[PDB]
Short mmCIF file of C-alpha atoms and ligand atoms in Angstrom, two decimals:
data_model
loop_
_atom_site.label_atom_id
_atom_site.label_comp_id
_atom_site.label_asym_id
_atom_site.label_seq_id
_atom_site.Cartn_x
_atom_site.Cartn_y
_atom_site.Cartn_z
CA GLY N 18 0.00 0.00 0.00
CA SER N 19 1.48 3.27 1.37
CA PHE N 20 4.43 3.46 3.80
CA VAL N 21 5.03 7.24 3.99
CA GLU N 22 7.21 6.86 7.14
CA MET N 23 9.80 4.85 5.07
CA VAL N 24 9.52 6.54 1.67
CA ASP N 25 12.68 8.61 0.89
CA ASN N 26 14.67 7.13 3.84
CA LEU N 27 17.83 6.38 1.75
CA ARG N 28 20.76 8.59 0.74
CA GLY N 29 23.87 7.92 -1.34
CA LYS N 30 24.69 6.85 -4.91
CA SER N 31 25.76 3.78 -6.94
CA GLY N 32 29.55 4.15 -6.59
CA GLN N 33 29.67 4.87 -2.81
CA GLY N 34 26.55 2.93 -1.71
CA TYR N 35 22.99 3.69 -0.51
CA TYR N 36 22.47 3.93 3.24
CA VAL N 37 19.69 4.19 5.84
CA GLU N 38 19.83 5.77 9.29
CA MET N 39 19.81 3.28 12.21
CA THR N 40 20.32 3.51 15.95
CA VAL N 41 22.25 1.04 18.09
CA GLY N 42 22.47 0.77 21.88
CA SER N 43 20.99 2.46 24.96
CA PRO N 44 20.88 5.47 24.84
CA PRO N 45 20.57 5.21 21.01
CA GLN N 46 23.72 5.87 18.94
CA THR N 47 22.80 7.10 15.46
CA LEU N 48 24.79 5.61 12.52
CA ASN N 49 24.34 5.62 8.73
CA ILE N 50 24.31 2.04 7.43
CA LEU N 51 24.82 0.85 3.84
CA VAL N 52 22.01 -1.42 2.59
CA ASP N 53 23.63 -4.63 1.31
CA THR N 54 21.51 -7.36 -0.28
CA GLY N 55 24.78 -9.21 -1.15
CA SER N 56 25.86 -10.12 2.44
CA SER N 57 24.27 -11.20 5.73
CA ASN N 58 26.10 -9.50 8.64
CA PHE N 59 25.13 -6.29 10.44
CA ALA N 60 28.67 -4.86 10.84
CA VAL N 61 29.50 -1.39 12.14
CA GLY N 62 32.70 0.67 12.65
CA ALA N 63 33.49 0.36 16.37
CA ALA N 64 36.92 2.04 16.55
CA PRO N 65 38.49 5.22 15.06
CA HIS N 66 39.18 5.15 11.31
CA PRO N 67 40.33 8.10 9.09
CA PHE N 68 37.09 7.90 7.01
CA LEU N 69 34.68 7.75 9.99
CA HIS N 70 33.45 10.78 11.96
CA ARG N 71 31.47 8.49 14.32
CA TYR N 72 31.39 4.85 15.38
CA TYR N 73 29.64 2.42 17.72
CA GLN N 74 30.89 2.86 21.33
CA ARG N 75 29.97 -0.40 23.08
CA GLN N 76 31.14 0.91 26.50
CA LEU N 77 28.44 3.66 26.26
CA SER N 78 25.57 1.19 25.69
CA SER N 79 23.84 -0.29 28.78
CA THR N 80 22.22 -2.98 26.56
CA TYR N 81 25.44 -4.14 24.88
CA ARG N 82 26.10 -7.90 25.29
CA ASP N 83 29.54 -9.31 24.43
CA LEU N 84 29.42 -12.69 22.61
CA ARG N 85 33.23 -13.13 23.30
CA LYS N 86 33.83 -14.23 19.70
CA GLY N 87 35.81 -12.67 16.84
CA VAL N 88 34.83 -12.61 13.16
CA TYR N 89 37.18 -12.34 10.11
CA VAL N 90 35.55 -11.47 6.76
CA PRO N 91 37.77 -11.37 3.66
CA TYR N 92 36.18 -10.49 0.29
CA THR N 93 37.61 -9.76 -3.20
CA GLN N 94 38.81 -6.16 -2.80
CA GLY N 95 39.47 -6.21 1.00
CA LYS N 96 38.44 -7.32 4.48
CA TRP N 97 36.80 -6.44 7.77
CA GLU N 98 37.43 -7.96 11.19
CA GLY N 99 35.62 -7.48 14.44
CA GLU N 100 34.03 -8.60 17.68
CA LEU N 101 30.58 -10.15 17.91
CA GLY N 102 27.88 -8.98 20.32
CA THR N 103 24.20 -8.07 20.49
CA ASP N 104 22.38 -4.79 21.22
CA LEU N 105 19.03 -3.07 20.72
CA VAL N 106 18.63 -1.73 17.16
CA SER N 107 16.00 0.57 15.58
CA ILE N 108 15.45 2.21 12.18
CA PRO N 109 14.14 5.79 12.82
CA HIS N 110 12.54 6.03 9.34
CA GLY N 111 11.39 2.44 9.51
CA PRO N 112 8.92 0.18 11.31
CA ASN N 113 8.24 1.51 14.80
CA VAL N 114 9.98 -1.42 16.56
CA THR N 115 13.24 -2.10 18.44
CA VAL N 116 14.91 -5.46 18.13
CA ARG N 117 17.71 -7.32 19.84
CA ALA N 118 20.17 -8.06 17.00
CA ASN N 119 23.66 -9.40 16.40
CA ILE N 120 26.23 -6.68 15.70
CA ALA N 121 29.80 -7.18 14.51
CA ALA N 122 31.84 -4.34 15.99
CA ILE N 123 34.50 -3.64 13.32
CA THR N 124 37.95 -3.14 14.89
CA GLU N 125 40.17 -3.55 11.77
CA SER N 126 39.48 -3.23 8.03
CA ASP N 127 41.18 -2.88 4.63
CA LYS N 128 39.36 -1.31 1.64
CA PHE N 129 35.99 -1.47 3.45
CA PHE N 130 35.08 2.10 4.47
CA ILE N 131 34.81 4.64 1.61
CA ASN N 132 36.12 8.20 2.05
CA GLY N 133 33.17 10.66 1.86
CA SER N 134 30.45 7.95 1.68
CA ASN N 135 28.75 9.18 4.92
CA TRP N 136 28.12 5.55 6.11
CA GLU N 137 29.67 3.81 9.15
CA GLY N 138 28.48 0.21 8.78
CA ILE N 139 26.63 -2.26 6.54
CA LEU N 140 23.32 -4.07 6.84
CA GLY N 141 23.60 -7.51 5.28
CA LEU N 142 20.07 -8.35 4.15
CA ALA N 143 20.69 -11.77 2.58
CA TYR N 144 20.26 -15.21 4.29
CA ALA N 145 22.01 -16.97 7.19
CA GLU N 146 23.83 -19.41 4.89
CA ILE N 147 26.36 -16.69 3.97
CA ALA N 148 26.56 -15.02 7.44
CA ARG N 149 30.06 -15.03 9.02
CA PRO N 150 31.58 -16.81 10.84
CA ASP N 151 28.74 -19.27 10.10
CA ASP N 152 24.96 -19.70 9.66
CA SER N 153 24.29 -19.75 13.44
CA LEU N 154 24.76 -15.91 13.53
CA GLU N 155 21.20 -14.80 12.92
CA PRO N 156 21.02 -11.96 10.31
CA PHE N 157 19.25 -8.69 11.25
CA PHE N 158 16.16 -9.20 9.07
CA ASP N 159 15.58 -12.72 10.53
CA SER N 160 15.74 -11.17 14.07
CA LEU N 161 13.37 -8.39 13.03
CA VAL N 162 10.77 -10.85 11.67
CA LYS N 163 11.06 -13.29 14.62
CA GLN N 164 10.74 -10.60 17.29
CA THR N 165 7.99 -8.36 15.77
CA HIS N 166 4.89 -8.60 13.54
CA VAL N 167 6.83 -7.09 10.58
CA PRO N 168 5.98 -9.08 7.36
CA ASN N 169 8.90 -11.14 5.93
CA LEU N 170 9.52 -8.83 2.93
CA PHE N 171 11.33 -5.62 2.12
CA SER N 172 11.57 -3.55 -1.05
CA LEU N 173 14.21 -1.19 -2.44
CA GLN N 174 13.96 1.85 -4.68
CA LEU N 175 17.56 3.07 -5.37
CA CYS N 176 17.45 6.46 -7.09
CA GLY N 177 20.34 7.43 -9.37
CA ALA N 178 20.33 11.23 -9.98
CA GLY N 179 21.39 10.91 -13.63
CA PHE N 180 24.16 13.47 -13.05
CA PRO N 181 27.03 13.91 -10.54
CA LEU N 182 26.16 15.06 -7.02
CA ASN N 183 28.86 16.98 -5.18
CA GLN N 184 29.62 16.44 -1.41
CA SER N 185 26.92 18.89 -0.24
CA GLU N 186 24.31 17.75 -2.79
CA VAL N 187 24.66 14.02 -2.02
CA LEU N 188 24.10 14.83 1.70
CA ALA N 189 20.98 16.91 0.93
CA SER N 190 19.47 14.65 -1.75
CA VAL N 191 16.98 11.78 -1.44
CA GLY N 192 18.69 8.60 -2.65
CA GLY N 193 15.65 6.31 -2.55
CA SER N 194 13.54 4.15 -0.23
CA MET N 195 13.82 0.99 1.73
CA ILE N 196 10.30 -0.21 2.62
CA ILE N 197 10.52 -2.68 5.50
CA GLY N 198 7.59 -5.14 5.62
CA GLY N 199 5.81 -3.99 2.51
CA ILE N 200 5.39 -2.61 -1.02
CA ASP N 201 4.72 1.08 -1.60
CA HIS N 202 2.73 1.59 -4.82
CA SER N 203 3.96 5.23 -5.29
CA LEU N 204 7.54 3.95 -6.03
CA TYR N 205 6.78 2.18 -9.32
CA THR N 206 4.70 2.31 -12.51
CA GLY N 207 3.11 -0.58 -14.38
CA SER N 208 3.04 -4.12 -13.04
CA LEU N 209 5.31 -6.06 -10.72
CA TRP N 210 6.73 -9.26 -12.24
CA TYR N 211 8.22 -11.96 -10.02
CA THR N 212 11.13 -14.33 -10.49
CA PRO N 213 11.77 -17.23 -8.02
CA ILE N 214 14.58 -16.99 -5.47
CA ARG N 215 16.44 -20.13 -6.66
CA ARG N 216 18.10 -20.77 -3.29
CA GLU N 217 18.15 -18.78 -0.04
CA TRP N 218 21.80 -17.74 0.47
CA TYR N 219 22.47 -14.74 -1.74
CA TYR N 220 19.29 -13.48 -3.49
CA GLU N 221 19.95 -15.91 -6.34
CA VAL N 222 17.92 -15.74 -9.60
CA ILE N 223 17.98 -17.36 -13.05
CA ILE N 224 18.47 -15.34 -16.30
CA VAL N 225 17.04 -17.24 -19.29
CA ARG N 226 17.80 -14.89 -22.26
CA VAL N 227 19.81 -11.71 -22.89
CA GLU N 228 19.17 -9.14 -25.65
CA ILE N 229 21.12 -6.06 -26.82
CA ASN N 230 18.62 -3.76 -28.66
CA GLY N 231 16.36 -6.80 -29.21
CA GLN N 232 19.24 -8.86 -30.68
CA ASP N 233 19.59 -12.20 -28.88
CA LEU N 234 23.12 -12.66 -27.40
CA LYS N 235 22.41 -16.35 -28.34
CA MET N 236 24.58 -18.01 -25.69
CA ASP N 237 23.69 -21.28 -23.88
CA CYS N 238 21.61 -19.80 -20.98
CA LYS N 239 23.78 -21.67 -18.42
CA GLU N 240 26.54 -19.19 -19.32
CA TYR N 241 24.43 -16.30 -18.00
CA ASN N 242 24.22 -17.90 -14.53
CA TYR N 243 27.73 -19.35 -14.30
CA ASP N 244 28.29 -19.93 -11.36
CA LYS N 245 25.29 -17.96 -10.02
CA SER N 246 23.28 -14.79 -10.71
CA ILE N 247 22.46 -12.54 -7.71
CA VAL N 248 20.74 -9.21 -6.95
CA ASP N 249 23.24 -7.08 -4.96
CA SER N 250 22.74 -3.47 -3.76
CA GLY N 251 26.35 -3.61 -2.35
CA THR N 252 27.93 -3.90 -5.85
CA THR N 253 27.97 -0.84 -8.14
CA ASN N 254 28.06 -2.45 -11.62
CA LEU N 255 26.18 -4.97 -13.67
CA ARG N 256 28.89 -7.71 -13.50
CA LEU N 257 28.76 -10.51 -16.05
CA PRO N 258 30.64 -13.84 -16.33
CA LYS N 259 33.77 -13.51 -18.51
CA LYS N 260 32.32 -15.10 -21.68
CA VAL N 261 28.99 -13.21 -21.37
CA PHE N 262 30.88 -9.94 -20.73
CA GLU N 263 32.97 -10.49 -23.88
CA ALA N 264 29.89 -11.23 -26.04
CA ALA N 265 27.83 -8.35 -24.52
CA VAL N 266 30.64 -5.77 -24.99
CA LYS N 267 31.11 -6.88 -28.61
CA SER N 268 27.36 -6.39 -29.21
CA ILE N 269 27.20 -3.02 -27.32
CA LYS N 270 30.26 -1.80 -29.32
CA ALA N 271 28.56 -2.88 -32.59
CA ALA N 272 25.29 -1.08 -31.69
CA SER N 273 27.16 2.14 -30.69
CA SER N 274 29.71 1.90 -33.58
CA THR N 275 28.88 5.40 -34.93
CA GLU N 276 31.25 6.62 -32.16
CA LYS N 277 34.55 4.96 -31.20
CA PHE N 278 35.49 4.71 -27.52
CA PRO N 279 38.94 3.86 -26.12
CA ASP N 280 39.63 0.39 -24.67
CA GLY N 281 39.93 1.92 -21.16
CA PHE N 282 36.29 3.09 -21.38
CA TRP N 283 35.05 -0.47 -22.11
CA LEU N 284 37.24 -1.76 -19.22
CA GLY N 285 35.31 0.61 -16.87
CA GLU N 286 38.51 2.53 -15.99
CA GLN N 287 38.31 5.69 -18.12
CA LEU N 288 35.56 8.26 -18.29
CA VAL N 289 34.03 9.47 -21.60
CA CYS N 290 32.83 13.13 -21.78
CA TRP N 291 30.46 15.08 -24.01
CA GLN N 292 29.67 18.82 -24.22
CA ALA N 293 26.94 19.66 -21.65
CA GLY N 294 23.58 18.11 -22.59
CA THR N 295 24.84 16.37 -25.75
CA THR N 296 25.29 12.79 -24.44
CA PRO N 297 24.27 10.63 -27.45
CA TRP N 298 22.00 8.26 -25.50
CA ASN N 299 20.29 7.09 -28.72
CA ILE N 300 23.49 5.51 -30.12
CA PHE N 301 23.73 3.18 -27.09
CA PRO N 302 21.52 0.10 -26.98
CA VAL N 303 18.97 -0.99 -24.43
CA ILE N 304 19.82 -4.25 -22.58
CA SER N 305 17.11 -6.80 -21.74
CA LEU N 306 17.54 -9.54 -19.17
CA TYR N 307 14.86 -12.23 -19.23
CA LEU N 308 14.19 -13.85 -15.88
CA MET N 309 12.43 -17.14 -15.06
CA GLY N 310 8.77 -16.48 -14.20
CA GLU N 311 6.58 -17.96 -11.48
CA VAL N 312 4.51 -19.90 -14.08
CA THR N 313 5.90 -23.04 -15.80
CA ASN N 314 7.52 -22.18 -19.20
CA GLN N 315 6.93 -18.45 -18.67
CA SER N 316 9.57 -15.67 -18.42
CA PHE N 317 9.48 -11.87 -18.27
CA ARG N 318 12.09 -9.23 -19.13
CA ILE N 319 13.62 -6.16 -17.49
CA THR N 320 15.06 -3.59 -19.91
CA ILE N 321 17.65 -1.01 -18.93
CA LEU N 322 18.84 2.05 -20.76
CA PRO N 323 22.33 3.51 -21.16
CA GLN N 324 21.09 6.07 -18.51
CA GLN N 325 21.46 3.09 -16.10
CA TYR N 326 24.64 1.40 -17.36
CA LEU N 327 26.62 4.68 -17.97
CA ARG N 328 27.42 5.98 -14.45
CA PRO N 329 27.68 9.80 -14.13
CA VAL N 330 31.05 11.02 -12.81
CA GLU N 331 32.53 14.55 -12.47
CA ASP N 332 35.35 15.32 -14.97
CA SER N 336 34.53 21.34 -16.71
CA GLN N 337 30.86 21.70 -17.73
CA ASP N 338 30.98 18.44 -19.71
CA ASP N 339 28.65 15.49 -18.94
CA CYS N 340 30.96 12.51 -18.16
CA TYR N 341 30.37 8.82 -17.46
CA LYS N 342 32.03 5.52 -16.69
CA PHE N 343 30.90 2.25 -18.30
CA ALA N 344 29.21 0.36 -15.40
CA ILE N 345 29.25 -3.15 -16.90
CA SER N 346 32.25 -5.26 -15.91
CA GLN N 347 33.62 -8.78 -15.94
CA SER N 348 33.16 -11.32 -13.13
CA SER N 349 34.67 -14.78 -12.31
CA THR N 350 31.91 -15.33 -9.63
CA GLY N 351 28.73 -15.13 -11.71
CA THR N 352 26.34 -12.37 -12.73
CA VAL N 353 25.82 -9.53 -10.24
CA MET N 354 22.81 -7.26 -10.76
CA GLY N 355 24.32 -4.27 -8.94
CA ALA N 356 23.11 -0.82 -8.03
CA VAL N 357 23.24 0.59 -11.58
CA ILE N 358 20.67 -2.14 -12.60
CA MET N 359 18.61 -1.70 -9.40
CA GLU N 360 18.37 2.06 -10.12
CA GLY N 361 16.04 1.26 -13.04
CA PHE N 362 13.58 -0.70 -10.91
CA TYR N 363 11.58 -1.00 -7.75
CA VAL N 364 12.80 -4.35 -6.40
CA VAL N 365 10.71 -6.45 -3.99
CA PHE N 366 12.59 -8.99 -1.87
CA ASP N 367 9.59 -11.21 -1.07
CA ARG N 368 11.26 -13.63 1.36
CA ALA N 369 7.85 -14.98 2.56
CA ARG N 370 7.04 -16.20 -0.98
CA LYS N 371 10.69 -16.96 -2.03
CA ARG N 372 10.52 -14.54 -4.98
CA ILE N 373 11.94 -11.23 -6.23
CA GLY N 374 9.67 -8.66 -7.87
CA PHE N 375 10.64 -6.04 -10.46
CA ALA N 376 8.71 -3.01 -11.68
CA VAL N 377 9.78 0.16 -13.52
CA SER N 378 11.02 2.65 -10.89
CA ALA N 379 9.17 5.96 -10.52
CA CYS N 380 12.73 7.49 -10.15
CA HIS N 381 14.60 5.84 -13.06
CA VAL N 382 16.56 8.19 -15.37
CA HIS N 383 15.38 8.16 -18.99
CA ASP N 384 14.93 10.43 -22.04
CA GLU N 385 11.92 11.54 -24.13
CA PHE N 386 12.26 8.56 -26.49
CA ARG N 387 12.96 5.48 -24.34
CA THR N 388 12.14 4.26 -20.85
CA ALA N 389 13.18 1.26 -18.75
CA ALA N 390 10.61 -1.58 -18.93
CA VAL N 391 9.36 -4.71 -17.14
CA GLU N 392 7.26 -6.80 -19.56
CA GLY N 393 5.81 -10.22 -20.02
CA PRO N 394 4.93 -12.98 -20.33
CA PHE N 395 7.13 -14.81 -22.87
CA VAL N 396 7.04 -18.51 -23.62
CA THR N 397 10.45 -19.94 -22.54
CA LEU N 398 11.22 -23.68 -22.33
CA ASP N 399 13.73 -25.69 -20.17
CA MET N 400 14.45 -22.72 -17.88
CA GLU N 401 15.65 -25.00 -15.01
CA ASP N 402 18.55 -25.98 -17.36
CA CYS N 403 19.72 -22.32 -17.24
CA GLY N 404 20.75 -22.80 -13.61
CA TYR N 405 24.32 -23.87 -12.90
CA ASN N 406 25.12 -26.86 -10.60
C1 779 Y 501 30.24 -7.39 -3.24
N1 779 Y 501 30.11 -7.27 -1.80
C2 779 Y 501 28.95 -7.01 -1.13
N2 779 Y 501 27.80 -6.85 -1.69
N3 779 Y 501 29.24 -6.93 0.22
C3 779 Y 501 30.66 -7.15 0.46
C4 779 Y 501 30.84 -8.41 1.31
C5 779 Y 501 30.30 -9.70 0.68
C6 779 Y 501 30.22 -10.89 1.64
C7 779 Y 501 29.48 -12.03 0.95
C8 779 Y 501 29.31 -13.26 1.84
C9 779 Y 501 30.64 -13.73 2.39
C10 779 Y 501 31.43 -12.60 3.03
C11 779 Y 501 31.58 -11.38 2.12
C12 779 Y 501 31.35 -5.97 1.16
C13 779 Y 501 31.22 -4.60 0.48
C14 779 Y 501 29.94 -3.90 0.94
C15 779 Y 501 29.80 -2.55 0.22
C16 779 Y 501 31.00 -1.65 0.48
C17 779 Y 501 32.31 -2.35 0.11
N4 779 Y 501 33.43 -1.48 0.42
C18 779 Y 501 34.40 -1.22 -0.54
O1 779 Y 501 34.44 -1.81 -1.62
N5 779 Y 501 35.28 -0.26 -0.13
C19 779 Y 501 36.47 0.15 -0.78
C20 779 Y 501 37.21 1.15 -0.18
C21 779 Y 501 38.39 1.59 -0.77
C22 779 Y 501 38.83 1.02 -1.95
C23 779 Y 501 38.10 0.02 -2.56
C24 779 Y 501 36.91 -0.41 -1.98
C25 779 Y 501 32.44 -3.73 0.75
C26 779 Y 501 31.19 -7.38 -0.95
O2 779 Y 501 32.35 -7.64 -1.23
#
């Protein structure tokens, strides 16, 4: 329905992350927390760090409980380490509840915190299977559902501005909404289409067909989900398996061939700039990802524009962008630049993910993002990797 208390409760952007305000401890300590559908730990800065102007002070919380256990979490680009405990947690622009939740107090980290991001911790919203050190550490959302009457569902509207936001603007701007326990109909247009959650660990899905401007990429659909496909608000780019990335870039280059871009642009390293207002959106193709539907032999598609996969960056008065599609060796990742096109419903209760066109997606007068269906698609279970 309508969840006015939670609409517009996010801030941030695709490259630095989207965050929500939370409070931890008694009396409450306010912290900004990155929303991460690609992990399952609630982990907060708990010691001084050059990029933090505040952190969780366990000694100041009367409700802090020490679990006397450490946690070490390496990931591709870095790591975070800390001390496990529990405390009372609330979301000011959220459901009006307070829960007793696990908290990893981060004491050491490498390439975790981001300078100028304005967030001090992360909220891992995925399932217990991928919680660290193991699946016995109950994730926040599981605690929330068990302890309150909050429905087992949340939805995310990540709003890309379509242009660079400076330090002051990104602090003053609305970055989107996280609706806890429901679906807010003001955040999307058209219909919601659902794809099954294949397995409850990451938010894993199955892609059954890929098009570039309606042209079928024509790969064996297992390639699109090798070794998994996930929906992850904690990754910036649309990341594709090596072979899929190579075929997609070849097709995107062919569609946009009226202009030549350097190799560094396609590698997502170098920006491309145009005179103010002259970005040639129309030369770049739309990208359609077909997802397995809830009905046997039925699929639907989500279509994104270059306004989603070209990420605005400051250079001058030129309009500059980075290519936000990159290679992966760990499967497809539908990151923030993809999520910015859609209102995404994480329907844990019904083991499904919903997509609808976002009321805040960036587009032009000629094209819009789309969510359409149904399409007849056979042997979709074969698209999943084992
Ligand atoms: C993809 N991804 C993700 N969605 N969450 C994590 C952890 C995954 C988790 C999966 C289950 C097993 C354990 C690991 C963490 C990520 C969160 C967003 C901010 C990032 N911070 C930076 O990247 N910071 C940074 C800072 C300076 C330089 C470079 C990067 C760090 C990750 O790698």
